[model samples]
Target chain A: GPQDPLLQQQRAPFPGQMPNLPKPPLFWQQEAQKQEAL
Target chain B: GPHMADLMADESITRMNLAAIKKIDPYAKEIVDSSSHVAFYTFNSSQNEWEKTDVEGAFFIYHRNAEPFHSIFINNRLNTTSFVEPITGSLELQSQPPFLLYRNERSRIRGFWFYNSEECDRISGLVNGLLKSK
Candidate 1:
């Protein structure tokens, strides 16, 4: 069976006069990335 | 006058008795036995899927002299126990709290035999964090 995707990618609203932007990673993501880079 | 004095003394005695009961009752120890098995799933960005994580544990609550002792056992071994002192400012019956079962695959053998308040709080905190990130 096709399990539902856990992380859904959504666009975030731009600061001013721009289209929606991809949401930035939270604290956990930064840590995960750092670990991966090591 | 003697009768009035006796009555006053009786009232004082009754008040002291009530106070003693309250103090002792609050500090008295009570046994709380609980068990549970929880499963966890984290979103894997690379695979774009949720992976299941297994967590099995149990805990006991001991209330003494109105204080509470919370102990957690994981994988059939005692993990840790903490003493919760009585809160004098706000009156709340101090006791071992509830247990929370985490996410796990559906299996009869993996369910918790008991649960407690502290464990439930931990699970709630984890879930809340996950929701906040999204």
Candidate 2:
């Protein structure tokens, strides 16, 4: 069973946005290549 | 009932600002800050700029805040007792050393990821490099 040790304690998630799935560092460029090939 | 949706919105864990970050990764530089904890930027002279940017682009929450007597590390399964003996139903196995407790705001049951870290030199390099930020 899933147990939480922080019963008395509390914690928050990080401040920024949730992450997207993985991609190449220059995924936008990849998209551009697709555009050019078409 | 409107507020009910955002009830958990109240910060459970304080954001790790520059001051807090200094204690976590003193060498890292603080980049952006706002409603949540701060984001960071890095300067890597050795690798190609794109490679450096690749690491720099990654995001993660480091353990420990500037506050005293408060840390989610122990609660994090990685450090928990019996931590990883066998993976049974609903018995989640913890991530390896140098990991982070990652989560999303929209996930029901408050979905979380025990992100594994990549190697730097002797220790792990990135906490949650497997994922990318918005």
Candidate 3:
């Protein structure tokens, strides 16, 4: 089955030093913290 | 061959100097480019800085000079397609800005919008040339 269309994160896992991943947006930050508390 | 491993590893590959290629807004998005590859970057409003990402609206370019050439787009989902896939430009009219149209891995049509007509033409031509050479 296919995953949720917009919920995926694409990454380049090639050799050498890689760039930093994008940080979660502010609105999503609270959801993450709340999940951790649960 | 085993004896040659260290020497092969010792071969120095030059570092890529990726420069910001284009920036588009309403919400800030950018294409960072080098001779060998391009990465997508987004302006993080909360952080007040740009961060690299391959999420929604991300477009990644690789194989500027090598084989197995491909690019990836993030539009609803991640899609990868070969460089040989045709890339064409949309004409600019008074009603709308020009953009590039290409097919994704699944043959779904995708569009890459540009800030200006000239930018659209330039990028379309560049990618078209890369496709031919592939």
Candidate 4:
């Protein structure tokens, strides 16, 4: 039962890391924080 | 009338096309019309899952000599006549002959392997950045 390839293969692998993309601009973070206070 | 600006523009486009051609060259060699052993994964973001799919023959990032012509093919027939739409985003995974998730214009996610992580990153960066440009 433990050797079922179909069951094992159904699981998808995750990168376990955020996308290697450019970080959001500094002002965007501040803007988000300001909006949260409202 | 053909003017200096038109000439320079055409020249620049040719250079740009050449650059993209060189970038996709390495993965082109990996393609086979009918693959004996290949694995493909398609990620469904709505379900946050990856489902392995059947690939009949090949997998490669395809480009044409024309402008803005790049697509990937992983069909059962491995036909170039039909190709996945322009890629929008990609997420690299950690593994040998590493796999990466590719998102197309439809926001559909598919997965394929590259020679290594660097190769994955190179192509991913090209498509991702190019898509961003548009």
Candidate 5:
């Protein structure tokens, strides 16, 4: 079967301004910690 | 034999360039170009970015000038199509902010990356139909 339509639709962003992420690095840091624990 | 090989080599080079298009997803608001022998595939990811859920593919057909082609919103099993275009000399896909295509000099034909056979068959059928119509 093809990929899920709901997932695909969710991938698209609605027309809006890009959000500012001042703590963007925090997201990656959490990911790194999760990987290290594994 | 040498001429054919040269053409094939050129096409391979184009394929390498097309591979770079994938980098645009992380950048999010940019256009990536790929080339074949004489054709190019210009990928504009500004409208949307590829996520884990997006079914996608990039490929090129060998021709005099290898041109780039790609498709998004490709989850459909049948009647699938991509927002694609044949880029010519110095033609930019993005001329304003938020545009996905950009002007460049390389032969910019990106490759096809298919996630399933159903979409592949659909695209093959589409190309065949277009050729027959032409």
Candidate 6:
């Protein structure tokens, strides 16, 4: 059971980091913020 | 009249600046068509979290006539097309390449249609600046 590919894949790491740290903001976050402003 | 201005405005994007980014990165550990962008790169892995990855950024660029017409970063991922273009209009040949790892709700990126690139040191500075700060 430990050798299952799907299980291994699920346990694997995600190459995720947000380093380009920009001030513009994400689309969803920007729009959400905008809608709230009004 | 102003149509030429469109090209004139970004007339700087040439082979050295735009096309240069296409070269596969040596640091990349995993690459995916991750969302709307053609290919996403993974450079670092979380030392503690198995489910978290450290994505450097999206290396989405298009080369033309040995030059770059448009460049897309995490900031200005959309160049000529509207931000919503990728949603309503579907263009073939990889508007959003037949994705594989897009099963989750958060790992979503809306790829835009390219109506248009090659190279520039200055342009790179432009995209990487706080002006387009994300």
Question: Which model scores highest in TM-score?
Answer: 4
- lDDT (C-alpha) at residue B78 in model 6: 33
Candidate 5 at residue A28, lDDT? Answer: 36
Question: Candidate 4: where is the Cα deviation over 4 Å?
Answer: A1-38, B1-39, B44-49, B65-68, B75-84, B87-98, B103-109
Highest-DockQ candidate: 2
Error at B35, model 1, angstroms: 6.7
Candidate no. 4 TM-score = 0.36
Residue-wise C-alpha lDDT for candidate 6, range A1-38, written one tens digit per residue:
23335545344544432223112224633443344354
Comparison by DockQ, 2 against 3, better one = 2
User: For model 5, how does the per-residue alpha-carbon lDDT over B1-134 read when each residue is reduced to its tens digit?
Assistant: 45443433456665554444433322222222221111122332333222222223343322221223322221121224332334233332211211122223432312233334344444444444434442
Give the share of true interchain contacts found in each model.
Answer: 0.00, 0.00, 0.00, 0.00, 0.00, 0.00
lDDT of 1 by residue, B1-134 (tens): 35444433445644543343334244433333222543222444555334443433333333343223222223322333222222122211111223222222221111122334466565445334434442
In order, the Cα lDDT scores of the candidates are 0.34, 0.28, 0.36, 0.44, 0.32, 0.28
**Winner of 5 and 6 under lDDT:** 5
Q: Return the candidate ranking by lDDT, descending.
A: 4, 3, 1, 5, 6, 2
B62, model 6: CA deviation in Å?
Answer: 4.9
Docking class of 5: incorrect
Global CA lDDT of candidate 4, please? 0.44
For candidate 6, the per-residue lDDT at B39 reads: 26
All candidates: TM-score: 0.21, 0.17, 0.29, 0.36, 0.20, 0.20
iRMSD of prediction 6: 9.9
Across residues A1-38, which tens digit of lDDT does each residue of candidate 5 receive? 33435545345655332222122234533443354354
- Cα displacement (angstroms), candidate 4, residue B57, comes to 4.2
For candidate 6 chain A, the 10 contiguous residues with the lowest summed lDDT are: A16-25
For B74-132, candidate 2 gives per-residue lDDT tens digits of 11222222111111122212232332222222221111222333322111122222122
Evaluated at residue A16, the lDDT of candidate 4 is: 31
Worst 10 residues of 5 chain A by lDDT: A16-25
lDDT of 3 by residue, B1-134 (tens): 35444544221332211122122111113232212233334443355454544433333343332233334332222334222232223222111234343333322223444435565565555565655563
**Candidate 2 residue A6 C-alpha distance from true site, Å:** 30
TM-score of 2: 0.17
Off by over 4 Å in 3: A1-38, B1-66, B69-97, B105-107
